[PDB]
Design a binder for this molecule. Structure first.
Ligand SMILES: *C[C@@H](*)[C@H]1/C(=C/c2[nH]c(/C=C3N=C(/C=C4\NC(=O)C(CC)=C4C)C(C)=C\3CCC(=O)O)c(CCC(=O)O)c2C)NC(=O)[C@@H]1C
Ligand SMILES: *C[C@@H](*)[C@H]1/C(=C/c2[nH]c(/C=C3N=C(/C=C4\NC(=O)C(CC)=C4C)C(C)=C\3CCC(=O)O)c(CCC(=O)O)c2C)NC(=O)[C@@H]1C
Ligand SMILES: *C[C@@H](*)[C@H]1/C(=C/c2[nH]c(/C=C3N=C(/C=C4\NC(=O)C(CC)=C4C)C(C)=C\3CCC(=O)O)c(CCC(=O)O)c2C)NC(=O)[C@@H]1C
Ligand SMILES: *[C@H](C)[C@H]1/C(=C/c2[nH]c(/C=C3N=C(/C=C4\NC(=O)C(CC)=C4C)C(C)=C\3CCC(=O)O)c(CCC(=O)O)c2C)NC(=O)[C@@H]1C
Ligand SMILES: *[C@H](C)[C@H]1/C(=C/c2[nH]c(/C=C3N=C(/C=C4\NC(=O)C(CC)=C4C)C(C)=C\3CCC(=O)O)c(CCC(=O)O)c2C)NC(=O)[C@@H]1C
Ligand SMILES: *[C@H](C)[C@H]1/C(=C/c2[nH]c(/C=C3N=C(/C=C4\NC(=O)C(CC)=C4C)C(C)=C\3CCC(=O)O)c(CCC(=O)O)c2C)NC(=O)[C@@H]1C
Ligand SMILES: *[C@H](C)[C@H]1/C(=C/c2[nH]c(/C=C3N=C(/C=C4\NC(=O)C(CC)=C4C)C(C)=C\3CCC(=O)O)c(CCC(=O)O)c2C)NC(=O)[C@@H]1C
Ligand SMILES: *[C@H](C)[C@H]1/C(=C/c2[nH]c(/C=C3N=C(/C=C4\NC(=O)C(CC)=C4C)C(C)=C\3CCC(=O)O)c(CCC(=O)O)c2C)NC(=O)[C@@H]1C
Ligand SMILES: CCC1=C(C)/C(=C/C2=NC(=C\c3[nH]c(/C=C4\NC(=O)[C@H](C)[C@H]4CC)c(C)c3CCC(=O)O)/C(CCC(=O)O)=C2C)NC1=O
Lengths: 193, 160, 161, 96, 68, 161, 161, 160, 160, 161, 160
């Protein structure tokens, strides 16, 4: 884990918040399961020195890998002799509060996703609906003069969904005078310019 | 319900509810106990209503239980009876709600496409509903009969 | 959007059951409080502008908000802010009438946080204004509908913050 | 459908109902059904009338943060009744 | 492919427009056959008067050759 | 990641071309300003905490962000915001040293916008803090490397917004 | 996860106010209803297994779920039930010990619909099973404590469907 | 709260609430009235406690209110008193909750980083909290004084 | 300003600037020194203008400063004079910019809503602006007086 | 968008200050160079197509870009690249006339980097073409406005890179 | 109050409470909840009602706030507003009591002598009470507005 080969491969191209999610799948055979876990491991990664006992060779990736390997969970399942293995549906009891996110991480296309997913998902659970298209978040094109961009969701997966329902009315900014939004002023397109 | 319809118009016009709308809500909540009574009576007598409406629809058009008919067979006719039970439950919901939002959102939008896909006679279904209309109005007082039959006629119109 | 009655009907229909004693008791629980809600809504509608005026006086104006550098500076931004206050008051009235914050979730708080962050609006100041409006509304309506009115203002404030 | 809506009418779609109304037309008549349904709306006649060209009317906050937003916000969030030492040093320097 | 030569006068009562609405109130225009229904209903619902309608493109009783 | 020299090297290797006179001018142009970048990096590393403190005092604190309901309310959120500021300063210094924003794209901007959208963090206020840090760093390092420092802070701000 | 005590504090903290009369009334109400909750939790425990068996017999078994094709046709599909259940108990026994939905939304009812949609698992059937346990626990627990247990079970069923 | 610390502790083992945990929850609900009364008593005298504690702190550590002090100036002193009021509010929250769980997440985690960034004397803030503890214990009976003071010493120890 | 208007029109047309637009830009840049001189004159005479505007305003409409009046009391008249100073500042901005864009963005759009909410006589504020116009035009030469009077007249007309 | 005059007006309006000596000095500094900007804009408008022709000839064509596998291969892509080059030239002229790059920030650079990354357009080649037009325009306009026009082309190139 | 007016009336004849009096006491205790709610609603808005009533009064009768006016000066105006607040308090007392017995003894008997001694315009005070009635009825529903205004009209009639 702390070798140069792993640093060049799973620490360079990714964000810290994505490096946590990849290290969880690599050294623990599972995905991060709670928002408090992500805060702890990110605060472990982010600081230059954390130290545990005595010595301070604990920076970023080195400190995070030590924290992951010395965890209570690791030395209770893959203790001291066993190469860690995927604890997917067959092996253990599967949690359901991150089913779709975790089974995307377990796939071998997981490193191809650079946008963090688990910290976003655990943040979405405790906040109102984000404003986007009622369908997936990649359905609204870039707002340029003549682009029609429409990010692909296959070139670089950044899939984001949200239960929108049918009566949720989007909030749009008025490109002009604020008091003519047509939601608090039924006749606003007919007053001046 | 009437609350939802009033709130939708108020939100559309960007204004609080009018005194007339508030009076309408007051009258609707006043009529709530009567509406509950009609719904309870129909719920208690639903099975007999379903069976009689089915018999009436079948002897109006027996072709549906013919070899080339959509409802030929025991399990083929049980589905038609279950559908009639479904619309009876929907009209009970509409009676308790006070207007046809639940019925509209549950059993008439896309019903043309669904029945075209299933190759089932929509006008035959309408006559089957009207049989339920007759059987249900036979078990209520005059103004309760008018109240339930208004929703039944709404379903009949919405079918075609 | 959904209200008490439609909520009961939907949560019985999705499980395919008929109206049982629990749903019936819920619906009479809504029915018993019909008059109080409509009376409070009529009072709020009659006193709409005064409530916004008093809430703005207590929480927003006569401060650095209305001076240059404040977000509420300039006539355009002042009008937009009082329009937002009217938005919150009217949707709180709708939620109080329907006995359900589903309308608040669907038509008020969805994306409001990100919209305010994009525009630079002070969310803490907005929550303070909402609470001032809640205090004034609780004063006007009285103990009869004070708690029912206050719960939806508190829902709006908790969603925003 | 969502991109053509922005071109023909100056705003993105509001509702799942609004999206589904054009979707269930596109599955029966195709591109001409969508464009004809969009151009024949009551909203088009009410807003753009018969002489005015369509124009951009609304923006999403994501798009609005792209046009502006570069170099962030210079205003500094001010808040009412807060205790702030900003400007006091400048006022003292001017008084001196 | 048929069209319509339509002359109509639309008065705007409650707006009161400040500048040059001859070209908006009274006008003659060509409209396709498939949109004449919607255009006529737009004129009617605004209180306008449909002065004249002409075919101008098609034939009176064509069973074929009239495809959109 | 890649610096100026490696960027030129890959740009020629993709064409399968021996490095030519123009690549030599690009490499010489980088090599000419080598020492100024090192001096600026040393100054920034020595004054890291002061830059963050001054930028926060100028652009973030004494606002509604620090009051109840604000985004940086509570000690945990204050520590998180200053940690993010330190992240931005450190990666800006790395980008100055490498002479290329590839490290900024790889290790900062990819998905940070969506993470901030999910968390409700004010991106506009964050970019304002980055600009205040840019002003302070330009003051400290002097005219020699002020522009070179400022270009990467502008890169971070443009990528975030 | 939050209880009433934590929920009131969290709601009163984002707006930065001391605990006033309304907060002390809510906390007082929870403290007054703090013994029946503890007793009914122990009653739900011990008789947990018989509750699950009776609920399964009342709703799940004796239907298409046991015949060939059902999602409880064989054992190990039957065994995934009793499990699946024992949750919806366990949880909501936690809810009617630290009474607030919160836990039921954060641990049990969150993405459960997605997991069931990816694994089969008839949601209407597993909601009828929930209502069966609601009836059995209302029978076992008592007259007054039948409610708020009915509240949390109804919340679980409604949220799932 | 104690309910949070007890229910989640019996959820990490996949069991119901232990019989050892169908206790001190009970003691907490029994002492809830006393805790609420103590919190209300502290809340009623929030301004007097803050003012007197700030007075004692500025006498004990006059360097902070000197020209080279972090809290020099009328508004810098206002901010110091506001911080003291914040910590009194957190102490009342801890008293009502029955555990230092809320005050820990609200105003302790990261406090070292925040105060180091602002260049404020953490020992001075700790002495201010001690002065608040003394003033609060002067207004309460012995048992309630000990009960509130124990949370006060928790804050003093945590800011260290 | 004129540059913003011309560039906006050209960009919306997707075209280079017309020679007429270039001529108007040349005229605007030529008149820059005179516009700056007028703005300097108004800025230096800002306080006397506001005081005299207040005096004729209170003479013309004494009911405004009366017990049921929006600006009764010394601080309410202070706020009225502050608003008059704000509008004089916006008039100087408009004179320097060469058009009414800054005035429209800063102090006209939504003024009806703001003053209706505050319950202030908009015709009274218009009369105050006219008094400011008279006092300002008494301090300028004829061409400059007409040039400033155009913006003052637009302000009075827009507040209507 | 903003020009120099509106930028100064807004910068003083946010502070609520009348125009003072410094603001008047900035305005005079703009007004002094008014006619030179207009003459340069007229020259650029007259030589628009020729500037694009020499810029393409010196920076893009006769390379791997125009051959098969090149991004500028095929008539569609060639017309697209020249249209983009024209857009850059026109908005550079607008920014030079207005004396402020806000129109470049608001109307061109917004999302352009992400668009070019998505389409596979070589940003390095685009920057090279922009600099080629910069040299040609500097040759045409002369010493008077060469640097003034050049700073906005450098602005566009730095915004893309 | 109604209880005092009923019990003492059936005490002047040496009989128990009348069977006709084991009524409207009954309606009084029935409507006591509404009376308390109306009194609380008036009490919450005491400052706004007094301020707006004083504003309307000073517009309609500006002679009182003139130099030859009884209420000329800032503190003589403060005294007038204090009297208006006193009468609003008495009106709330009358509303809760259900009878004008308390308000009569507190602020009506001898009011003519007091105001004649102080040389105050009693018609002006009556008009102030009328303005207070208008402002109060603007904040209430129709039935409650009528109930409060009936006592307000009692005050207006008595001050006459
Ligand atoms: C009077 C009966 C007529 C008839 C009916 C018929 N129905 C089916 C099958 C289905 N009908 C439904 C209906 C509904 N789903 C809904 O959600 C609602 C409203 C709430 C309705 C009304 C559905 C879903 C089915 C599919 C099967 C199923 O769900 O189990 C069929 C079977 C089709 C076939 O040919 O196999 C019939 C025959 N047929 C008649 O002749 C009557 C007039
Ligand atoms: C000036 C500070 C602003 C602010 C910030 C803020 N951030 C968080 C939480 C997180 N910030 C990050 C950031 C990064 N992860 C990365 O990999 C990088 C680049 C390498 C960055 C910049 C992440 C991942 C988180 C989430 C994890 C966590 O919670 O620690 C928070 C906390 C939000 C919360 O309480 O949930 C804040 C407040 N807030 C402001 O108001 C400032 C403008
Ligand atoms: C007894 C006073 C001591 C002291 C304090 C001091 N504090 C500040 C500034 C801030 N303090 C806070 C505090 C908090 N934010 C939170 O969320 C919490 C938890 C509830 C706390 C305690 C914050 C955010 C600030 C920043 C400014 C702001 O609030 O907007 C200062 C100002 C220092 C400066 O340089 O500006 C002081 C002086 N100083 C002393 O000497 C005392 C020991
Ligand atoms: C007022 C107390 C605070 C404040 C507000 C403020 N808001 C805007 C602009 C907008 N506000 C909205 C809001 C909504 N649209 C919706 O559909 C809903 C849900 C009901 C809400 C809440 C929107 C969309 C906008 C932008 C588009 C528009 O104007 O319609 C402004 C103006 C910002 C500007 O100048 O561009 C302001 C000032 N500001 C404060 O300081 C108060 C705390
Ligand atoms: C006034 C002296 C006489 C008079 C006039 C009158 N006119 C209308 C309505 C319209 N007037 C216009 C005019 C124009 N439209 C244009 O495009 C232009 C170019 C500048 C002009 C001059 C038109 C077309 C209308 C109809 C639409 C509209 O109202 O704007 C009315 C109202 C008619 C009605 O009620 O529909 C009247 C009364 N009436 C008199 O008595 C005077 C002799
Ligand atoms: C029983 C009444 C119904 C039913 C259920 C069923 N479930 C599964 C499998 C799983 N169920 C879960 C559930 C959860 N995980 C959680 O964390 C929680 C909340 C804390 C829940 C509710 C999960 C994750 C699985 C998969 C992993 C596992 O088995 O533990 C099955 C098995 C499906 C299969 O054969 O693959 C079944 C059958 N079936 C019925 O018929 C009822 C309607
Ligand atoms: C003065 C001639 C008239 C008058 C004015 C009056 N104004 C207020 C209060 C405010 N006025 C403003 C104005 C503005 N905000 C802006 O951004 C702009 C554009 C530059 C303007 C003009 C505001 C924001 C307020 C609110 C208070 C504040 O500034 O914080 C009052 C006070 C009303 C009150 O109820 O307190 C008055 C009296 N009144 C007259 O009678 C004159 C005709
Ligand atoms: C030309 C020097 C380089 C080049 C360019 C190239 N661009 C496209 C396609 C597009 N370019 C744009 C550009 C803009 N949209 C805006 O709003 C602005 C600023 C206002 C710009 C500059 C867009 C949106 C597109 C996509 C839509 C379209 O094609 O019109 C292409 C075509 C790519 C394709 O075939 O899909 C090309 C080739 N190519 C080079 O080799 C040069 C370095
Ligand atoms: C292929 C292996 C296999 C079997 C056999 C199996 C059995 C099985 N028997 C069941 C019930 C049942 N089974 C029986 C009875 C009997 N059972 C017997 O094997 C005897 C022949 C008989 C008693 C003499 C009864 C009475 C029930 C109802 C539950 C109850 O007893 O309360 C159930 C519960 C669902 C239901 O009611 O249908 C299962 C899953 N599942 C499997 O995967």
């Amino acid at each position: 884990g702390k070798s140069e080969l792993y640093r060049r491969e799973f620490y360079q191209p990714f964000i810290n918040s994505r490096v946590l999610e990849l290290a969880f799948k690599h050294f623990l055979g599972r995905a991060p399961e709670s928002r408090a876990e992500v805060q702890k491991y990110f605060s472990i990664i982010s600081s230059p020195i954390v130290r545990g006992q005595s010595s301070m060779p604990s920076g970023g990736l080195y400190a995070l890998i030590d924290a992951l390997i010395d965890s209570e969970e690791y030395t209770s399942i893959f203790g001291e002799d066993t190469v860690p293995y995927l604890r997917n549906l067959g092996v253990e009891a599967q949690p359901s509060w991150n089913w779709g996110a975790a089974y995307d991480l377990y796939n071998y296309a997981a490193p191809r996703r650079k946008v963090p997913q688990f910290i976003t998902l655990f943040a979405d659970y405790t906040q109102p609906l984000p404003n986007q298209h009622p369908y997936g978040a990649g359905n609204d094109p870039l707002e340029i003069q003549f682009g029609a961009i429409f990010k692909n969701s296959t070139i670089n997966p950044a899939e984001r969904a949200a239960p929108i329902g049918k009566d949720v009315k989007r909030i749009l900014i008025r490109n002009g005078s604020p008091t003519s939004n047509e939601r608090g002023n039924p006749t606003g397109m007919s007053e001046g310019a | 319900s009437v609350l939802t319809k009033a709130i939708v118009n108020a939100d559309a016009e960007a204004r609080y509810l009018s005194p007339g709308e508030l009076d309408r809500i007051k009258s609707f909540v006043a009529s709530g106990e009567r509406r509950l009574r009609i719904a309870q009576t129909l719920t208690e007598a639903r099975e007999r209503i379903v069976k009689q409406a089915g018999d009436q629809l079948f002897q109006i058009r027996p072709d549906v239980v013919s070899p080339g008919g959509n409802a030929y067979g025991e399990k083929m006719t049980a589905l038609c009876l279950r559908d009639l039970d479904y619309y009876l439950r929907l009209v009970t919901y509409g009676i308790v709600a006070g207007d046809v939002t639940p019925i509209e959102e549950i059993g008439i939008i896309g019903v043309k496409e669904m029945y075209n896909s299933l190759q089932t006679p929509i006008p035959a279904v309408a006559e089957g509903v009207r049989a339920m209309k007759n059987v249900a109005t036979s078990l209520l007082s005059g103004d309760d009969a008018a109240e339930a039959g208004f929703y039944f006629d709404y379903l009949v119109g919405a079918m075609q | 959007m959904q209200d008490a009655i439609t909520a009961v009907i939907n949560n019985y229909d999705v499980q395919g059951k008929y109206l049982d004693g629990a749903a019936l008791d819920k619906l009479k629980a809504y029915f018993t409080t019909g008059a109080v809600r409509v009376r409070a809504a009529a009072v709020i509608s009659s006193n709409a502008t005064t409530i916004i005026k008093e809430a703005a006086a207590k929480a927003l104006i006569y401060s650095d908000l209305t001076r240059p550098g404040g977000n509420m500076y300039t006539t355009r931004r002042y009008a937009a802010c009082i329009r937002d206050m009217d938005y919150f008051l009217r949707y709180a009235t709708y939620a109080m009438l329907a006995g359900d914050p589903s309308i608040l979730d669907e038509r008020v708080l969805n994306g409001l946080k990100e919209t305010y962050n994009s525009l630079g609006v002070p969310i803490a100041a907005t929550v303070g204004g909402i609470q001032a409006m809640k205090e004034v509304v609780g004063g006007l309506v009285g103990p009869d509908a004070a708690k029912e009115a206050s719960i939806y203002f508190d829902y709006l404030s908790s969603g925003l913050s | 459908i969502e991109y053509i809506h922005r071109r023909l009418l100056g705003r993105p779609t509001y509702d799942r109902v609004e999206n589904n109304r054009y979707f269930d037309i596109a599955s029966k008549k195709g591109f001409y059904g969508v464009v004809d349904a969009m151009l024949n709306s009551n909203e088009y006649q009410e807003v753009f009338g018969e002489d005015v060209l369509p124009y951009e009317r609304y923006l999403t906050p994501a798009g609005l943060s792209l046009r502006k937003g570069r170099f962030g916000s210079s205003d500094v969030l001010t808040t009412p009744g807060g205790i702030t030492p900003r400007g006091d040093a400048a006022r003292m320097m001017d008084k001196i | 492919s048929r069209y319509f030569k339509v002359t109509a006068c639309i008065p705007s009562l409650k707006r009161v427009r400040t500048g040059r609405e001859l070209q908006n109130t009274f006008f003659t225009k060509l409209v396709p056959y498939e949109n004449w229904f919607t255009e006529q209903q737009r004129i009617q619902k605004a209180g306008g008067k449909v002065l004249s309608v002409k075919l101008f493109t098609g034939v009176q009783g064509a069973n074929t050759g009239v495809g959109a």
